[PDB]
Amino acid sequence: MKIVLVLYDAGKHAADEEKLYGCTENKLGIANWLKDQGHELITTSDKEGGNSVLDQHIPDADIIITTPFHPAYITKERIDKAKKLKLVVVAGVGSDHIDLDYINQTGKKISVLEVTGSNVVSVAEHVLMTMLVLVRNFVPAHEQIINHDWEVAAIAKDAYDIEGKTIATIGAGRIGYRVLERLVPFNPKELLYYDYQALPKDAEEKVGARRVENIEELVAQADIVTINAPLHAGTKGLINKELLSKFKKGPWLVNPARGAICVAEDVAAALESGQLRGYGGDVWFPQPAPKDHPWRDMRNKYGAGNAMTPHYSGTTLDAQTRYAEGTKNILESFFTGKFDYRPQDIILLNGEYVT
Amino acid sequence: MKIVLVLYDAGKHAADEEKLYGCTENKLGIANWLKDQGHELITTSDKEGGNSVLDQHIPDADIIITTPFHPAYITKERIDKAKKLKLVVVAGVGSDHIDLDYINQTGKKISVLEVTGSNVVSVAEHVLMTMLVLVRNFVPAHEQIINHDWEVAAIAKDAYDIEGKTIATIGAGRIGYRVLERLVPFNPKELLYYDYQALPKDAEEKVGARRVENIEELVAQADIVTINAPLHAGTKGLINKELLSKFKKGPWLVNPARGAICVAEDVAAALESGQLRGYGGDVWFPQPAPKDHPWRDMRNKYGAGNAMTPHYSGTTLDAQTRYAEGTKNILESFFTGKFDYRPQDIILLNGEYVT
Amino acid sequence: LSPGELDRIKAFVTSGESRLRIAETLTGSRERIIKSAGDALFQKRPDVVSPGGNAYGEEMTATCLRDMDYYLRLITYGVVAGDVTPIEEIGLVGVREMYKSLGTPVDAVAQAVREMKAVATGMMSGDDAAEAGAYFDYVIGAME
Amino acid sequence: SPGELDRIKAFVTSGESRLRIAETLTGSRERIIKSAGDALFQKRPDVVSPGGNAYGEEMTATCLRDMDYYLRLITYGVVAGDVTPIEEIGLVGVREMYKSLGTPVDAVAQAVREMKAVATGMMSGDDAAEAGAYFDYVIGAME
Numbered sequence: 001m002k003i004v005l006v007l008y009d010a011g012k013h014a015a016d017e018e019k020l021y022g023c024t025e026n027k028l029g030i031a032n033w034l035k036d037q038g039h040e041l042i043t044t045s046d047k048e049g050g051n052s053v054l055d056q057h058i059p060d061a062d063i064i065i066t067t068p069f070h071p072a073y074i075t076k077e078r079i080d081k082a083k084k085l086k087l088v089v090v091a092g093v094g095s096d097h098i099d100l101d102y103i104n105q106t107g108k109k110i111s112v113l114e115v116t117g118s119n120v121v122s123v124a125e126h127v128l129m130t131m132l133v134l135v136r137n138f139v140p141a142h143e144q145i146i147n148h149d150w151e152v153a154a155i156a157k158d159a160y161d162i163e164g165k166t167i168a169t170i171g172a173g174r175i176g177y178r179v180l181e182r183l184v185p186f187n188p189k190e191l192l193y194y195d196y197q198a199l200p201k202d203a204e205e206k207v208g209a210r211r212v213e214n215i216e217e218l219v220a221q222a223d224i225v226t227i228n229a230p231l232h233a234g235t236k237g238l239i240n241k242e243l244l245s246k247f248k249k250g251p252w253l254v255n256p257a258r259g260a261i262c263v264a265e266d267v268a269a270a271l272e273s274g275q276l277r278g279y280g281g282d283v284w285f286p287q288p289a290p291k292d293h294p295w296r297d298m299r300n301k302y303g304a305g306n307a308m309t310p311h312y313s314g315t316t317l318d319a320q321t322r323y324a325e326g327t328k329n330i331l332e333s334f335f336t337g338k339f340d341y342r343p344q345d346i347i348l349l350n351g352e353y354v355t
Numbered sequence: 356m357k358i359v360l361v362l363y364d365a366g367k368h369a370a371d372e373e374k375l376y377g378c379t380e381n382k383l384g385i386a387n388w389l390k391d392q393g394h395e396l397i398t399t400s401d402k403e404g405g406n407s408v409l410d411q412h413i414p415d416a417d418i419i420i421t422t423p424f425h426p427a428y429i430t431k432e433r434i435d436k437a438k439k440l441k442l443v444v445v446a447g448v449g450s451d452h453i454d455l456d457y458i459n460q461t462g463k464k465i466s467v468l469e470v471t472g473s474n475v476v477s478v479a480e481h482v483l484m485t486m487l488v489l490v491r492n493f494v495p496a497h498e499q500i501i502n503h504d505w506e507v508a509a510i511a512k513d514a515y516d517i518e519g520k521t522i523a524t525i526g527a528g529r530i531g532y533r534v535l536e537r538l539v540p541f542n543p544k545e546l547l548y549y550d551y552q553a554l555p556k557d558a559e560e561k562v563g564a565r566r567v568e569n570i571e572e573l574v575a576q577a578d579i580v581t582i583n584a585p586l587h588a589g590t591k592g593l594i595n596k597e598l599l600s601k602f603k604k605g606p607w608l609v610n611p612a613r614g615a616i617c618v619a620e621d622v623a624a625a626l627e628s629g630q631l632r633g634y635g636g637d638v639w640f641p642q643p644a645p646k647d648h649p650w651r652d653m654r655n656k657y658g659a660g661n662a663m664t665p666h667y668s669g670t671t672l673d674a675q676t677r678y679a680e681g682t683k684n685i686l687e688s689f690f691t692g693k694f695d696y697r698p699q700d701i702i703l704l705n706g707e708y709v710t
Numbered sequence: 711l712s713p714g715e716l717d718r719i720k721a722f723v724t725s726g727e728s729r730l731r732i733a734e735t736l737t738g739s740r741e742r743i744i745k746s747a748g749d750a751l752f753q754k755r756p757d758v759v760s761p762g763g764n765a766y767g768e769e770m771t772a773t774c775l776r777d778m779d780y781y782l783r784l785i786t787y788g789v790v791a792g793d794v795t796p797i798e799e800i801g802l803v804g805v806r807e808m809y810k811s812l813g814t815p816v817d818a819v820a821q822a823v824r825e826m827k828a829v830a831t832g833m834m835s836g837d838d839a840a841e842a843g844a845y846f847d848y849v850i851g852a853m854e
Numbered sequence: 855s856p857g858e859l860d861r862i863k864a865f866v867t868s869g870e871s872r873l874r875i876a877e878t879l880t881g882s883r884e885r886i887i888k889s890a891g892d893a894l895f896q897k898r899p900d901v902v903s904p905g906g907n908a909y910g911e912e913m914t915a916t917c918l919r920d921m922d923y924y925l926r927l928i929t930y931g932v933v934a935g936d937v938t939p940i941e942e943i944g945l946v947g948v949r950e951m952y953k954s955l956g957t958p959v960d961a962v963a964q965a966v967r968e969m970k971a972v973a974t975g976m977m978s979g980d981d982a983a984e985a986g987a988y989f990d991y992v993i994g995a996m997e
């Protein structure tokens with residue numbers, strides 16, 4: 001019962017706010033419980049390089065706990081050297097940093113669990129926020145006031161209502177369906193989706209959505225496109241110069257899924273030429289973004305159309321409380337030997353997929 | 356047959372965008388139509404001072420057309436000098452700049468019309484956008500990227516979801532009711548309203564809203580407050596230091612109604628002390644905002660919590676097209692002598708109210 | 711801070727005492743003025759009755775007498791100061807379409823201020839009653 | 855990179871087996887897919903009504919399209935140094951991707967085995983050994 005968990009260092013910000021659970025200083029709010037229970041807890045942010053605290057303790061550890069906002073990469077190299085490992089937890093949602101194929105093909109006896117559901121509302125709200133900010137031209141308008149200007153015609157000339165627009169999502173899982181739900185009362189012209197599997201007929205009708213089976217047919221009729229899909233072959237590098245030339249002229253694109261689904265230099269060129277009128281979201285490749293990444297400085301012809309943020313949509317204080325509670329629930333199912341996990345939380349039960 | 360309309364000068368922006376109808380260069384898209392009939396059209400932005408183009412032609416004009424984004428103040432003095440005036444049109448919604456009481460009590464035979472409905476969706480979308488930007492802490496997040504930084508903990512420590520919050524509107528007319536409709540699928544804890552008149556019971560139940568009959572009881576239970584009310588006695592200066600001290604600690608306030616409903620220096624002090632966590636909106640007093648107006652530089656303790664813009668929510672290109680069509684419809688009802696106005700558009704019909 | 715304002719204030723301090731005597735009566739007898747005037751109002755406008763009755767409640771009747779107190783305190787402020795400008799800017803700006811949206815008959819609010827004028831000036835000298843009467847009239851004129 | 859420059863110069867200056875393999879894969883690529891598809895569907899009659907992930911005329915044509923993708927990708931690998939471009943473009947999350955589509959992964963492996971047999975049969979004994987290693991790299995990721 002040795003436990004290693006890696007989180008980022010929040011510095012002075014950790015003392016300002018006690019509900020900032022997912023950091024090295026505050027330890028997901030479970031440190032006192034683990035110590036009372038007789039377990040040993042190593043907490044560190046030092047995860048890169050062969051001389052790292054993480055590597056120093058992995059040959060020993062029984063449990064490793066990770067976060068997608070500072071991921072420890074659980075490589076086969078590290079997996080072979082981890083002789084006592086029985087359980088990997090994601091305090092959040094997202095497991096691209098773990099070699100699930102290796103574990104499953106080798107048949108190792110390692111369970112892998114995440115707190116599924118805990119991030120979906122927060123991301124969906126961030127999509128709605130970014131669409132309104134781009135379509136209504138908010139960023140240059142707030143800039144005028146901070147800078148002590150006032151010139152309405154310069155803002156109004158590229159501002160629209162979202163009412164009456166056609167809106168499409170690439171991906172209709174938990175996050176994309178919740179985006180569609182929140183858009184219904186804004187009176188769009190139509191809602192559309194593309195996905196490798198159909199939504200059930202009852203779910204389609206609740207939001208008035210129509211399935212489009214061809215990706216190029218989908219984007220060619222949309223004023224607004226949002227990406228809510230996983231990263232694999234056939235989605236990696238999907239948003240390139242060729243597909244971008246099928247978009248309507250002057251629409252808006254939002255991506256809070258994975259940065260590598262886009263070709264970074266190609267969307268920047270589309271924004272400068274006017275093929276796109278704006279781009280926004282919070283995911284990058286590489287991540288964290290280098291200081292010279294092209295998405296930092298790109299603009300449209302009027303000097304706006306950029307609504308990027310760092311990667312934080314799933315880390316609001318309401319979301320942090322949910323996976324503090326979810327991590328302790330998972331750990332206790334293990335400690336007790338009940339193994340009464342929530343079915344939706346299991347992504348690998350002793351190196352095996354379920355159902 | 357002689358018409359004066361006053362709009363702002365848009366300068367070079369007018370040539371960039373044909374649908375920017377409400378400006379001096381583009382003339383609401385109805386020049387040519389007016390010239391093809393037998394009418395003379397004066398267009399000017401020069402409305403202040405007794406030496407003005409507006410005053411130059413008031414003694415003679417048959418019709419005056421105004422906009423709430425650059426209003427010509429139709430004072431009793433000007434009304435006395437306007438020997439031939441028979442019709443005042445607002446190309447938009449909002450008639451505070453016209454002395455309706457003087458026209459009505461004196462019994463002058465001047466009718467007054469606006470294009471009602473044309474602005475309400477645009478303003479309601481701007482309220483939803485501002486609530487999300489403040490609650491989720493967007494402004495300092497975008498600033499980190501523009502400035503070539505990356506520090507997630509400094510953003511996350513004051514970012515929340517809108518799900519599960521209690522939200523109240525002061526005023527439940529056309530705009531406030533459309534705000535409530537768009538909030539329903541975001542799963543708030545409860546929706547509340549205050550108004551001098553009750554909503555019908557079927558309308559209350561469609562959005563799950565509860566009437567609160569006392570203004571201090573309303574704000575004391577709300578996490579988010581939005582103002583959607585007209586300006587008069589007992590609304591003027593309503594948001595002052597005493598009422599602000601009844602708000603919950605650390606909530607958010609949004610105002611796209613009228614600036615003078617707030618005491619400007621009192622809300623700035625509340626934001627600095629932490630009584631308010633953020634303030635946003637697009638309306639000011641005085642307006643346009645002086646370069647030293649306190650709402651430009653005010654921030655909360657973390658340097659954020661400010662989402663002000665200049666006054667533009669009702670001036671998107673979609674709203675401007677509606678204004679242009681509605682103005683020509685009103686003018687034609689007058690020119691033909693049918694006077695078949697839409698009932699909702701009438702505020703004064705020959706100097707008196709209708710019912 | 712304007713020279714005309716300073717002049718109006720210095721007059722209250724240094725010259726005539728009629729503004730001082732008027733304010734003594736309005737503050738000292740304020741509760742009797744409202745109670746006596748409300749009785750007279752409801753005898754002249756029995757629309758404290760079931761139907762319309764904008765003031766039909768025991769609760770709504772108390773809200774009406776609250777508004778009467780507002781205007782008496784605002785007229786008191788005007789007497790102490792130079793002038794009627796604060797009465798205009800605080801009590802009369804949106805009034806009328808405000809009361810219209812409440813269902814309150816505007817000419818009945820004017821009549822309430824007439825009834826306060828009669829009780830108050832009845833307690834004053836002949837000269838003080840003429841000076842005080844002009845401030846009441848300024849409110850009545852905006853509502854009738 | 856010097857190691858990459860070296861593998862390119864070898865194609866230009868030294869051995870000609872990579873050139874010969876590429877000549878065959880481009881020159882009869884349509885015959886390789888048509889012949890291998892026939893053999894696949896005889897060994898896995900799951901062009902049948904039930905599951906049949908490839909049941910339609912339309913879904914059968916999508917299957918043969920994917921076979922064309924892997925043949926063009928293996929051709930690129932032969933021309934270049936190595937198998938790195940094969941891994942990063944054709945194998946990323948391929949097991950989870952096909953699983954979400956309903957298509958059995960071990961049947962995709964069998965399709966690449968069938969393309970290996972036809973293509974290799976048109977080559978010299980030595981060229982067929984060299985080409986065969988590239989086909990095997992794909993087969994191993996799906997079986």
Ligand SMILES: *[C@H](C)[C@H]1/C(=C/c2[nH]c(/C=C3N=C(/C=C4\NC(=O)C(CC)=C4C)C(C)=C\3CCC(=O)O)c(CCC(=O)O)c2C)NC(=O)[C@@H]1C
Nearest residue numbers: 588589764765770773774777780800801812814818819822
């Ligand atoms: C009594 C003479 C009449 C009467 C009065 C009445 N008023 C209301 C409600 C309101 N009155 C006001 C007035 C003001 N508030 C201010 O701050 C100022 C400036 C000093 C004024 C003049 C307001 C704002 C309201 C509404 C908000 C509130 O109550 O705070 C009512 C209640 C009406 C209802 O149906 O809810 C009544 C009854 N009514 C009569 O019929 C009398 C003639």
Ligand SMILES: *[C@H](C)[C@H]1/C(=C/c2[nH]c(/C=C3N=C(/C=C4\NC(=O)C(CC)=C4C)C(C)=C\3CCC(=O)O)c(CCC(=O)O)c2C)NC(=O)[C@@H]1C
Nearest residue numbers: 233234907908913916917920923943944955957961962965
């Ligand atoms: C034929 C051997 C088998 C078969 C194939 C089959 N595939 C699909 C759908 C897709 N195939 C891919 C594959 C790729 N796209 C890429 O860009 C790359 C990288 C080079 C690869 C490997 C993708 C992305 C899809 C989905 C999206 C698209 O079609 O563009 C289908 C259709 C399945 C359906 O039900 O819709 C089929 C039938 N199926 C079999 O049964 C054979 C064993």
